[PDB]
């Protein structure tokens, strides 16, 4: 049952996180998506295959005997994210008081990302289970050179009253609209330490 | 129920005498004119009848605005466009500046793209009009006409160059843009410098004029000229290298005067121009 979800996520990654796809590859991956939805079935399926037929009026003479389908390898770079500042390995944590904000400067480079101003977000996880999805503003994605972009931003860490020093999770996410989120950076755990105010 | 209420409001405008209420009705007509799939072409004659007997100023302005809006909606019916050009040239001589702005915009957006009056020269006469805003709108209409695909004439450069010494702000930027585009039209023509007996390519004259223009006391026009210098490739290289001889301190030495000007914006624009003109010529 989860193998269908894995198919879906791999197709998502091949679609969005990659650069230089042609219409042929789109045909192939949408066919894989149709297979995934048909197999996770075991009403909406008919409307979605109708939409597929409407948007793919040209590929029908090219999808003969479909639901193996050849995948041409075009000419390609896998985008990635390198969270740098801060490292979090420092035993020196970040101090905060008995209920207040605290600032966290995220400084991370991205390589060969397709227009990161839209499809990138930062995700914050408290050990409880909530999730903050901070969309970054436009003017915080610097542009140092071809295929390389820089993201320096501020993230606001706090919550209800905290008793003991703990860890928090900050990572990147690729947001896509076909509505979904793809994790593609190694998360960074930051240590936060309390000190009630004076 | 468009034409019905339109005719009722026109019979109102005929019987109502207050100009402000008349303008309210006219704005209502202008906002209703944009009904996609309706035929306000039946009302173009009525609009012309309204403007044939006006006594105010803004009324004709927004009415010709509606006429331009509907002419841009059906740009293929050349007969309607010629009728609009006719009534505009009829109204072009009006004393007010707003109505003239509207007629020049109508000419710019609905000019004849075929090479039967010479709308080019009719508009170009207005680079000597009294209110400089009229000249601004005139140059903007020139730009609009050119950018639709019409190739222009040579004389426009020789008329625009006069405005380079004018003492207003937007007019100079528009003039520099016009020189830029017209020199991108006729670059290689030979023009003689009247200060001597030498004769240089028209592109070189354009370049030197823009360089000297960068030495203006306004910064907006400086940004404009510094940017517009960026894509001027076909100009001869020796002139270009002369534009950096810091020892000669306005057709030369412009880049030095820019990269250390007061407002960093013109500096940045000069950097862009240097980058482009260096990517084109390695020496």
């Amino acid at each position: 049952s989860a193998a269908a979800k894995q198919i879906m996520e791999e197709t998502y990654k091949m679609e969005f996180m990659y650069s230089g796809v042609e219409n042929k590859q789109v045909v192939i991956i949408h066919h894989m998506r149709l297979q995934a939805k048909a197999l996770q079935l075991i009403e909406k399926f008919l409307q979605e295959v109708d939409f597929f037929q409407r948007y793919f009026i040209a590929d029908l003479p090219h999808l003969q005997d479909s639901f193996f389908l050849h995948l041409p390898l075009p000419e390609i770079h896998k985008a990635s994210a390198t969270i740098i500042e801060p490292a979090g390995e420092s035993d020196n944590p970040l101090r905060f008081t008995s209920g207040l904000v605290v600032a966290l400067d995220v400084d991370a480079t991205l390589e060969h990302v397709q227009d990161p101003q839209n499809t990138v977000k930062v995700q914050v996880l408290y050990p409880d289970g909530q999730a903050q999805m901070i969309h970054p503003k436009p003017a915080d994605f610097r542009n140092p050179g071809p295929g390389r972009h820089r993201l320096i931003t501020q993230v606001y860490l706090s919550h209800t009253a905290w008793t003991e020093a703990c860890q928090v999770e900050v990572r990147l996410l690729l947001a896509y609209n076909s509505e979904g989120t793809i994790p593609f950076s190694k998360p960074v755990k930051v240590y936060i330490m309390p000190k009630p105010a004076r | 129920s468009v034409e019905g209420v339109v005719r009722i409001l026109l019979e109102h405008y005929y019987k109502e005498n207050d100009p402000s209420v008349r303008l309210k009705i006219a704005s209502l007509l202008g906002l209703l004119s944009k009904t996609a799939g309706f035929s306000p072409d039946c009302i173009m004659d009525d609009a012309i009848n309204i403007l044939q007997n006006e006594k105010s100023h803004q009324v004709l302005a927004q009415l010709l605005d509606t006429l331009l809006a509907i002419g841009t909606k059906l740009p293929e019916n050349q007969a309607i466009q010629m009728r609009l050009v006719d009534v505009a040239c009829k109204h072009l001589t009006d004393t007010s500046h707003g109505v003239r702005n509207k007629c020049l915009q109508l000419l710019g957006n609905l000019g004849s793209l075929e090479k039967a009056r010479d709308v080019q020269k009719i508009i170009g006469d207005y680079f000597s009009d009294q209110d400089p805003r009229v000249r601004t709108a005139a140059i903007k209409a020139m730009l609009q006409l050119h950018e639709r695909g019409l190739k222009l004439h040579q004389t426009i450069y020789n008329q625009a160059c006069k405005l380079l010494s004018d003492d207003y702000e937007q007019v100079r930027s528009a003039a520099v843009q016009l020189i830029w585009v017209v020199s991108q039209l006729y670059p290689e023509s030979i023009v003689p410098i009247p200060s001597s007996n030498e004769e240089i390519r028209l592109v070189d004259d354009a370049f030197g004029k823009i360089c000297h223009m960068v030495s203006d006391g306004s910064w907006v026009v400086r940004v404009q000229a510094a940017k517009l210098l960026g894509s001027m490739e076909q100009v001869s290289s020796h002139f270009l290298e002369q534009t950096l001889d810091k020892k000669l301190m306005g057709a030369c030495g412009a880049f030095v005067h820019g990269l250390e000007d007061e407002m960093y914006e013109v500096r940045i624009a000069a950097v862009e121009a240097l980058c482009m003109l260096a990517q084109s010529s390695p020496s």
């Binding site: 605290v102 606001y156 | 207050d18 402000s20």
Partner: protein, 483 residues
Amino acid sequence: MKLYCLSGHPTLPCNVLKFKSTTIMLDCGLDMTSTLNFLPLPLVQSPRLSNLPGWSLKDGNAFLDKELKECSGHVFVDSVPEFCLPETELIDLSTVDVILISNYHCMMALPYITEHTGFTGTVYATEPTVQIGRLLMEELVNFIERVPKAQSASLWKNKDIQRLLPSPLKDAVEVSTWRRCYTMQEVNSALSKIQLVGYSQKIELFGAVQVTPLSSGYALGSSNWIIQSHYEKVSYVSGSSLLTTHPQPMDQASLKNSDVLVLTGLTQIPTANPDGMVGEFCSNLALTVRNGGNVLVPCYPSGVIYDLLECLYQYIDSAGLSSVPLYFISPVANSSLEFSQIFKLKHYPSIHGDFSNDFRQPCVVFTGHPSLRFGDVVHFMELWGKSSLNTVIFTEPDFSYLEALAPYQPLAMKCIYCPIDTRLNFIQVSKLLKEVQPLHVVCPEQYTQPPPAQSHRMDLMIDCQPPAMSYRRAEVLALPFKR
């Protein structure tokens, strides 16, 4: 001569004075109470407001259960605070040739006007007003865009669906022209078009018109304009004060012989004594600082605060309050205090960073935008909204305070309301009119009829003869003079 009044707001004025040749724009402003229908923009994920009961339609034809939220009897849109705006339909904003300015509290709408729609003129303003205006626009652009919440809400915006949602949202006006805030580069480029002007510095216009400002005593560099000609004289006097504060007191004698006095920007609290209300403010601050609790006083980071602080200082030495710090939290603190000085309070740039090492309770914390919907005040109003000891003390008449406080209910902290309006009240404007003797008067509809809340009074209407012609939102008046 024509007057295209755009902004129907009574104290955030804006109007296009259309003339013989030029078409001037007296003091385009930004209605800002539209941000009251929207939820707040809290810094950290607010556990109380992320899990509000998603309000549902009775029929449920659409999935409104994700846009609107319900809290304690009021339902709100979930989006970024989509500010209000002056109508952009009557006159095309390119014909405008010159935009004057009165004072910072009315210039917050220049980025919307002179950058998005192709404006070609150059705006005038005195020096202190352009400085404080840059400062205010900076705090706004830095508050709204610190944790962006761009997830919009569009289904509610239609007229048909609007007519089926109760008050306060059905009370909304012109819901189709509401916009998200502008960006940084926009305001930074827009303020470059400013051309500074000093007092009585005669400025000409196309050999046709003449403009000149005069000190008006409302705030630093605040100004009453004069737009005269060879045959006409218009005396724009927007938001002047006659109580002799720090600014150079107004020139109530130059406005004589005028032909049209477009009087806008009078008080919003006609039944409130400024001095008495400041006394009430000091009183409540002392009452809830001398027991242990805090206090949270929203106020713009300029303007009335420089009044307020001053009085508070004269109160610190007349009641012995030495042991309580007095903060100023805003991302425009330093430049604010510098521009108040060069023309105990420990200012800070932002609640994050340095500030969290000086927090000694009890305290007093003046903060960001006073519509309780963004900035920092949201964070405290979520921190102190549970202890019956603490206190909020409104000192701004701009945003009606009831609905403003509403979306944090049910709250157990006191909420005093003592507004400080140094503006001209109605008896003073009657005296001022009988002194200056204007030949006519133009005032928004909120004035020539008594206020709605206090229908029985008939003395707070601006009484003047001939009767004062009024204007409604987005109207086109004709000042009945014939050359």
